[PDB]
Swiss-Prot record:
Molecular functions per Gene Ontology: G protein-coupled receptor activity; photoreceptor activity; retinal binding
Name of the protein: Rhodopsin
Recorded family membership: Belongs to the G-protein coupled receptor 1 family. Opsin subfamily.
Membrane topology recorded in Swiss-Prot or TrEMBL: Multi-pass membrane protein
Keywords: Cell membrane, Cell projection, Chromophore, Disulfide bond, G-protein coupled receptor, Glycoprotein, Lipoprotein, Membrane, Palmitate, Phosphoprotein, Photoreceptor protein, Receptor, Retinal protein, Sensory transduction, Transducer, Transmembrane, Transmembrane helix, Vision
Domain of life per record: Eukaryota
GO CC field: cell projection; membrane; plasma membrane
Glycosylation sites: N5
The keyword Membrane is annotated on this UniProt entry: yes
Ranges of compositional bias, category Acidic residues: 340-349
Biological source species: Todarodes pacificus
Cellular localization per UniProt: Cell projection, Rhabdomere membrane
Role this protein plays: Photoreceptor required for image-forming vision at low light intensity. Light-induced isomerization of 11-cis to all-trans retinal triggers a conformational change that activates signaling via G-proteins. Signaling mediates the activation of phospholipase C. Subsequent receptor phosphorylation mediates displacement of the bound G-protein alpha subunit by arrestin and terminates signaling.
């Protein structure tokens, strides 16, 4: 009353949770780090994703419908970083307090919300593609089509949102956390309403995808055993340059799938630790969930949205191709060599004169036109 005080942790527009109050304040330096640190991720991430969008949307050698996913992901993880990063969290941090609106805090999360599920759920979609290009027997393969793709996207979106929109209507809720500088979902209060949402969040916005992801990269792994007989047995029926077109086109997609695995490898590790912390604080030793118990790990997890680019930039071919032509200075520590792209190119050579036995071909692979 007339210049209100209580402690550091007091935040005028947001109802802190008692738990975050029962501790003593973190030092002036962690906040700044927490600032500086998540500033770096605003940059890096809105960098990569931006580029990534920019390349994959312009570079002609990449208009493959399957990639519109890459786009989507580059997109999600961008937004995320944009918002989740600067300006909100970094300032809250530089000023040990969350300057922005209550709704500011409500959104900050929702965003991350959508865009956490987006990235993850999306990988699934990709993984679906790889299965249609590698797990199913050579004979039955279906490459991605501008149509299917765009539907999936939309399935994704609706979804991504659905499971994070809950809190925006009181089922669960978003407030401050850790050092009260960022914002996040409510995993403390164990009432019937909050707890109910929380579990859907885990099963629906997270496991739900994982099941699918795993379901593929197994069905694929196991169907490779079979591939060597198919790449050797239909390696008899062909010329010396159509076999390379078959192995090169089978040696490449492979990589794409290998890459996306290393991503899901990425996503899985950065979120789960915090994720674990979450459930704990929702089911076990709440006394444990100390400041660092939530904040130090929620960082690694927000960070999860800025690796893909770096990862790609050390392993995707066609990409590096485009990097180097407009932005080589980035590949400064992982330079390009004309070699890598050969494997691909030979996938797109044409047909008049080579392979025509007395058992003529017509394959079934997305060529319908009105
Ligand atoms: C930094 C602010 C954050 C991370 C706010 C919100 C996060 C979510 C809605 C997260 C949902 C999930 C994550 C991060 C990992 C496990 C699965 C999940 C759906 C509970
Ligand atoms: C070759 O080694 C490429 C990586 C070079 C590492 C240099 C970057 C270190 C992290 C600094 C982050 C940007 C700082 C922005 C200016 C303060
Ligand atoms: C080609 O150069 C590909 C890019 C290589 C990545 C450069 C690494 C800089 C990333 C900064 C983050 C590392 C800080 C250490 C914290 C674990």
């Amino acid at each position: 009353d007339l210049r209100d005080n209580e402690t550091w942790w007091y935040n005028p527009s947001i109802i802190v949770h008692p738990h975050w109050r029962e501790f003593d304040q973190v030092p002036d330096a962690v906040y700044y780090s927490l600032g500086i640190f998540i500033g770096i991720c605003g940059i890096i991430g809105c960098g990569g994703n931006g580029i990534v969008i920019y390349l994959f949307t312009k570079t002609k050698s990449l208009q493959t419908p399957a990639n519109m996913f890459i786009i989507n992901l580059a997109f999600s993880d961008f937004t995320f970083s944009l918002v989740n990063g600067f300006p909100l969290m970094t300032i809250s941090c530089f000023l040990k307090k969350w300057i922005f609106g209550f709704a500011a805090c409500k959104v900050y999360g929702f965003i991350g919300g959508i865009f956490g599920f987006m990235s993850i759920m999306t990988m699934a979609m990709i993984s679906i593609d790889r299965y249609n290009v590698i797990g199913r027997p050579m004979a039955a393969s279906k490459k991605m089509s501008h149509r299917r793709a765009f539907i999936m996207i939309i399935f994704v979106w609706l979804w991504s949102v659905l499971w994070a929109i809950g809190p925006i209507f009181g089922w669960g809720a978003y407030t401050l956390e850790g050092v009260l500088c960022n914002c996040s979902f409510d995993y403390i209060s164990r009432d019937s309403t909050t707890r109910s949402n929380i579990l859907c969040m885990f099963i629906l916005g997270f496991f739900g995808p994982i099941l699918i992801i795993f379901f593929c990269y197994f069905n694929i792994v196991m169907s490779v055993s079979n591939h060597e007989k198919e790449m050797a047995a239909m390696a008899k029926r062909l010329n010396a340059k159509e076999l390379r077109k078959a192995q090169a086109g089978a040696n490449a997609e492979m990589r794409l799938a290998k890459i996306s695995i290393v991503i899901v490898s990425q996503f899985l590790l950065s979120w789960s630790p915090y994720a674990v912390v979450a459930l704990l604080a929702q089911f076990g030793p709440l006394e444990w969930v100390t400041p660092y118990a939530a904040q130090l790990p929620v960082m690694f997890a927000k960070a999860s949205a800025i690796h893909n680019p770096m990862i790609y930039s050390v392993s995707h071919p066609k990409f590096r191709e485009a990097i180097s032509q407009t932005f080589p200075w980035v590949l400064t520590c992982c330079q390009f060599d004309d070699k890598e792209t050969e494997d691909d190119k030979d996938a797109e050579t044409e047909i008049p004169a080579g392979e025509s036995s007395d058992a003529a071909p017509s394959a079934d692979a997305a060529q319908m036109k009105e």
